[PDB]
Every structure is written in structure tokens, then in C-alpha cells.
């Protein structure tokens, strides 16, 4: 009836890959105080395309081993793209402060996602900087985890309010990147992205890649 | 202290196998990738294995692709490395080396390296 | 597949001059190429990463500069702790693996 151990088999195989280049190989990302976002999903999701892509730049992800991710599958998937200063990438962590940290960007304390970063230097420039990227300087208090603000009021560092129209202490809240295809290292245009894994409570979940294996037949009673 | 050491030089015959280790000391060992480069007399470095951090999913060259096996544990602090089918051309120098980046997964630069152990093969 | 090509094949100075190595990668890679430098019999030790970076152990006199497939470093003075032989590495993803140079070697005029 039964056999010796090596006849077992896997594989009820499938394919069609999905949109990661679609938000990696962007043209064009959108700015950090209006940070891109997108939900992902009914696709395997192929990381081991990400990994081995030897074009990233400071790429890590916390709480759970990616190679060991690509089996445990997670649905509404949602990622990020946006871009930061140079020196500033790492920033982007859990229970970390700065200046993204306040007043552009929180992440989610004991997050369990990845944020993928890079270096783009060759075109997200221009001779005397691609001022198309800008980042907000004030706001009343901390953000929230996952929510963006484009507006134009104001801080009001004194008592007076200011009435719409920048002046001396107005502190119009939005101010721009420079960036020179020739500054430094730390001042490099970082473009960046994040996932997150968010599995709300939510049946009929989306899962991923089980890469292969070759049949081998004439051999019964395992599967 | 923050130092590499590498051990397990020797000779062996080919087809045969040898099994290397290096010693970790002065920093966290289970925060930073470790590779395994080797330099064959008289010759260039030639990258050989690498391991993430966490030792989850592990590269190897062409040239030991599915023939070496490289693993850390962490209880010890040593990284090893084991040899299966090795032949006349493995000779070499092999400098156990770390990651330069902190907890990330690049893997791309070496940026502390172990004093190199002599690895030789013939009959 | 990148395959580093790296010219002059071998430079000759005298010390407290200017040397400059080059560096051509095969096809681009933004920022990431890293110089090592090895004495004879010694352990080599990483000079630049990012290929503008001075790492940490690294007098300022040390300088590097280039992206996508131009890549020079560059020594103001040379004292004899650099002449060396030097390599210039950087990594790929078909099949995914790293590439180091076919070295330069560094000799003294007199």
C-alpha cells in the first residue's frame, strides 16, 4: 500500500506576476507631504524579483525575514512612493524621531512591513535642480500612522494670525528640495518606497509565489 | 576587540571536503551580513558566498553554485562555511569578511576582513 | 552581467604627487562601486563606498568620484602606507553575485 518516503509532491502550479514595476519604474513619484500610495492586490506577489535587483540602495524590511515572507502570504498589500533627502533615508523606521518623523511622515510603531529605498541621482535632477518635490516644515503636533495633509494654513510662530498671504514670520508651510546633480552624497535625491502588510481582519486573502518542482510519475499513494 | 579570525587552514584532497570557520568579536554578530571571499595565488579576489544577518536566504557564486554551504550561528558567534566536491582550482587564501551596512540587505560592500586562511588541494 | 574594467593597468609615481585610477563599469549602476586597497600579503581594507564616501579609518586625503559607468579615485600625496595594489568592485542580480576589478598595481620612479 505505502512506500518508501521520496514519492511526495507540490506544485499545483500557476503564474501572472504583478504591478511592482509598475510602482518601482515610476517616471515620476509624487512628493513627500503628498506621498503616492496604492492598494495591491489578487496577484502573487514575486519578491524574489525585488532582492536580487542589485539597483537598490539601503533596502530592509523588519519583523519577519522576507525569504521566509514569500511563503506567508498577506493581503491588502498597500506600498508608498515618495522621495526624502540624502542623509535622511534612514529616518524612515519604526519609533524613530527626526524631522519626517513629526511633521511628513510617521510610521506605524511595531510595524512589520519593508521600506525600499534608493539612490536615483541620474534623473530625478536637472542643471540647477528639479524643484518638483517639497516638504512641510510645520504642524500643530505629531501625525497619525498612514495620513496625509496638503494645505495651505499656516503655523503662526507669534500671536497675530497670518491672513493667507506669506510674511516675515507667515512660515508658508511648504518649502522645496534643492538638489545639484553635483552635491554630495548626503544630499542625494533618495526616491523611496514602503509597504505595508496589512491583513484587517479580511477573508479571501491574495498569496504568492511557491516556485516549482519537475513531476516525477508511475509512482502511487503520495501527493 | 572589534576584530575577525578566521580558522580551519589546511590541504586536502579533491573530491573530498573541508569545512571553515571564522570567529566574530567586538560587535553585534547577528545584526550584520557576513561573506566568504576568496583569493587564489597569485590572482584577484573572487567573491565566493554571502549570508544575510539573519541567515534566511544565503548566494554563492557560479563557480561553487551548489557545492558549498555557508551558515552562522549565532550561539557561538562564528560564521562557518563547508566544501563539497572541491577541486584543484578552490586553492586560495579564503578571507571570511563583513557586510558594511547595519541591519540592511544590500549586501554590497566589505568592509572588515578576516587575516585569510590558507586552503590548498592536491594529491 | 558587470565585469569591471579598470585602467591605467598599472601606475608609477613618485610619492607626494597626484594619482588617479580609473575605473569603467560595464553598464550603469547609479552610485555603487567601492575601492579596496591591499599591500602585499596584507588583509584589504574597504577605502570608499558609494564611490564618494570616505569610509570611517580613512585620512581626508582620500577622495573618490563618479556614476553609472565612470569611476575614478583620486590621492592627493602618496606615502608609502598606499602603494599598493587596488581593486574596484560592485555588485549584480543576473545571476545575482559581485565583481570586483583585475586589480592596478602601484610602483615608485626613481
Known amino acids: 500500500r505505502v512506500q518508501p518516503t521520496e514519492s511526495i509532491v507540490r506544485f499545483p502550479n500557476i503564474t501572472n506576476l504583478c504591478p511592482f514595476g509598475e510602482v518601482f519604474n515610476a517616471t515620476r513619484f509624487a512628493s513627500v507631504y503628498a506621498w503616492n500610495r496604492k492598494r495591491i492586490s489578487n496577484c502573487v506577489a514575486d519578491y524574489s524579483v525585488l532582492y536580487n535587483s542589485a539597483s537598490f540602495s539601503t533596502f530592509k524590511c523588519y519583523g519577519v525575514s522576507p525569504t521566509k515572507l514569500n511563503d506567508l502570504c498577506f493581503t491588502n498589500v498597500y506600498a508608498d512612493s515618495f522621495v526624502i533627502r540624502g542623509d535622511e533615508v534612514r529616518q524612515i523606521a519604526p519609533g524613530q524621531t527626526g524631522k519626517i518623523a513629526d511633521y511628513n511622515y510617521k510610521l506605524p510603531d511595531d510595524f512589520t512591513g519593508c521600506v525600499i529605498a534608493w539612490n536615483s541621482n541620474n534623473l530625478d535632477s536637472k542643471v540647477g535642480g528639479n524643484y518638483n518635490y517639497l516638504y512641510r516644515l510645520f504642524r500643530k503636533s505629531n501625525l497619525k500612522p498612514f495620513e496625509r495633509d496638503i494645505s495651505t494654513e499656516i503655523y503662526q510662530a507669534g500671536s497675530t494670525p497670518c491672513n493667507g498671504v506669506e510674511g516675515f514670520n507667515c512660515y508658508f508651510p511648504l518649502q522645496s528640495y534643492g538638489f545639484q546633480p553635483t552635491n554630495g552624497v548626503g544630499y542625494q535625491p533618495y526616491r523611496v518606497v514602503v509597504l505595508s502588510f496589512e491583513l484587517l481582519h479580511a477573508p479571501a486573502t491574495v498569496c504568492g509565489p511557491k516556485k516549482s518542482t519537475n513531476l516525477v510519475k508511475n509512482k502511487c499513494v503520495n501527493f | 576587540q572589534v576584530q575577525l579570525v578566521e580558522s580551519g587552514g589546511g590541504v586536502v584532497q579533491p573530491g573530498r571536503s573541508l569545512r571553515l570557520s571564522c570567529a566574530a568579536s567586538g560587535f553585534t554578530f547577528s545584526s550584520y551580513g557576513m561573506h566568504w571571499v576568496r583569493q587564489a595565488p597569485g590572482k584577484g579576489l573572487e567573491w565566493v558566498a554571502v549570508?544575510?544577518?539573519?541567515?534566511?536566504?544565503?548566494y554563492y557564486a557560479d563557480s561553487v553554485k551548489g557545492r558549498f554551504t555557508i551558515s552562522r550561528d549565532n550561539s557561538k558567534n562564528t560564521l562557518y562555511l563547508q566544501m563539497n566536491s572541491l577541486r584543484a582550482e578552490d586553492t586560495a587564501v579564503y578571507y571570511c569578511?563583513?557586510?558594511?551596512?547595519?541591519?540592511?540587505?544590500?549586501?554590497?560592500?566589505?568592509?572588515?576582513w578576516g587575516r585569510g586562511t590558507l586552503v590548498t588541494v592536491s594529491g | 552581467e558587470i565585469v569591471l574594467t579598470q585602467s591605467p593597468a598599472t601606475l608609477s609615481l613618485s610619492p607626494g604627487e597626484r594619482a588617479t585610477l580609473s575605473c569603467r563599469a560595464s553598464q550603469s549602476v547609479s552610485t555603487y562601486l567601492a575601492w579596496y586597497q591591499q599591500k602585499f600579503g596584507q588583509a584589504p581594507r574597504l577605502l570608499i563606498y558609494?564611490?564618494?564616501n570616505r569610509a570611517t579609518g580613512i585620512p581626508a586625503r582620500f577622495s573618490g568620484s563618479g556614476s553609472g559607468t565612470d569611476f575614478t579615485l583620486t590621492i592627493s600625496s602618496l606615502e608609502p602606507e598606499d602603494f599598493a595594489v587596488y581593486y574596484c568592485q560592485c555588485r549584480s542580480n543576473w545571476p545575482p553575485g559581485i565583481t570586483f576589478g583585475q586589480g592596478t598595481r602601484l610602483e615608485i620612479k626613481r
Open positions: 569578511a563583513r557586510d558594511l551596512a547595519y541591519r540592511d540587505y544590500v549586501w554590497r560592500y566589505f568592509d572588515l
Open positions: 549570508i544575510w544577518y539573519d541567515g534566511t536566504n544565503t
Open positions: 558609494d564611490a564618494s
